[PDB]
Amino acid sequence: MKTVTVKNLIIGEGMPKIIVSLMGRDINSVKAEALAYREATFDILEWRVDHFMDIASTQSVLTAARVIRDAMPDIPLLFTFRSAKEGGEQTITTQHYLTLNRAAIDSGLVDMIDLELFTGDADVKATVDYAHAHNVYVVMSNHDFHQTPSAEEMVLRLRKMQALGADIPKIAVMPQSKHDVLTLLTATLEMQQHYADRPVITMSMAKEGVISRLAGEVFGSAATFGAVKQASAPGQIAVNDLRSVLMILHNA
Numbered sequence: 001m002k003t004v005t006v007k008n009l010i011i012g013e014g015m016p017k018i019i020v021s022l023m024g025r026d027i028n029s030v031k032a033e034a035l036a037y038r039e040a041t042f043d044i045l046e047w048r049v050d051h052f053m054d055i056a057s058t059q060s061v062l063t064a065a066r067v068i069r070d071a072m073p074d075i076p077l078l079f080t081f082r083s084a085k086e087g088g089e090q091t092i093t094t095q096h097y098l099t100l101n102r103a104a105i106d107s108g109l110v111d112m113i114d115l116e117l118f119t120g121d122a123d124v125k126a127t128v129d130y131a132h133a134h135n136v137y138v139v140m141s142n143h144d145f146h147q148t149p150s151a152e153e154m155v156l157r158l159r160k161m162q163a164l165g166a167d168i169p170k171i172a173v174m175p176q177s178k179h180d181v182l183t184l185l186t187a188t189l190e191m192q193q194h195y196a197d198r199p200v201i202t203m204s205m206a207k208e209g210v211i212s213r214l215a216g217e218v219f220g221s222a223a224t225f226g227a228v229k230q231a232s233a234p235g236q237i238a239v240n241d242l243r244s245v246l247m248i249l250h251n252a
C-alpha cells in the first residue's frame, strides 16, 4: 500500500476519511457556503466545480477557488468537475475540462484533483503526469448512475485506474437490488485483499447502498461522503451522523 498524505491527513490508514462537497452557483454563493462549511467537522473539502455557472471562465473558476482556500487555509481541498455523463450538473468539452484541471493544479490552491477515467486513457495519463509534476494528487473516478457492474468488472476498472497512475481510484455505482450492494462490497474487499497498492474509494449509491458509505473500515473504502445540508449524490447522510457511525465502528 502506498498511502496518500495531504496536510497531515493520511488516506488509506485508520478510519475512512470524511469528504463533503461544496456546491455554489456563483462567487457569492461559494463564499457563503465556504463560511458555513468551515463550521462542520470533516477531513476533506471537495469543491464541485460543475455546480458553478461561470465555468467558461478559467479566471472566474480560479477566483472561486481562492475564496474557498481563504476561508479554509488548512483544509485538504479536492477540485472536482463532475461531468453530466457521470451524474454532474453540466457538460463541457474535454479540452476545457483538462484546461480547468491544469489551472487548478497550477494555482497551488488545491491538494487533489478528480479525473474521470472515461475521459480517455491518453488524456488522463498526461494529466496525471502533469498533476504529479506539480505535487498534486489525483482521485481517478468513475460513476455509474444506472447500474452496478459485476465485481470482477469493478476490480478491473479500479486496477486500470491504478495502472494509469491514480493515487486514489474511486468508483460509485447505482444498485438495482440489494444484491448489487453486496457486489460493491465484494469488489471493495477484493481490492483490499489482493490489489492493495493504492487506497480506493467505493460506494453503492442511493438509500439501498447507504451501508457501503458506513462500512469502509472493514472492507476497504478509504473515504466516504457526507452531506452538510444537501447531498452531492444520492445516498449521502448528514455528515455528523456519518461521523458518529464511523467512530462507533472504529472503536467497536
Ligand SMILES: *C[C@@]1(O)C[C@@H](C(=O)O)C[C@@H](O)[C@@H]1O
Pocket: 021, 046, 048, 080, 082, 141, 143, 170, 172, 203, 205, 225, 232, 233, 234, 236
Ligand atoms: C466522488 C463523487 O462522485 C462521489 C459522490 C458520491 O457518490 O457520494 C459525491 C460527489 O460529489 C463526488 O464527486
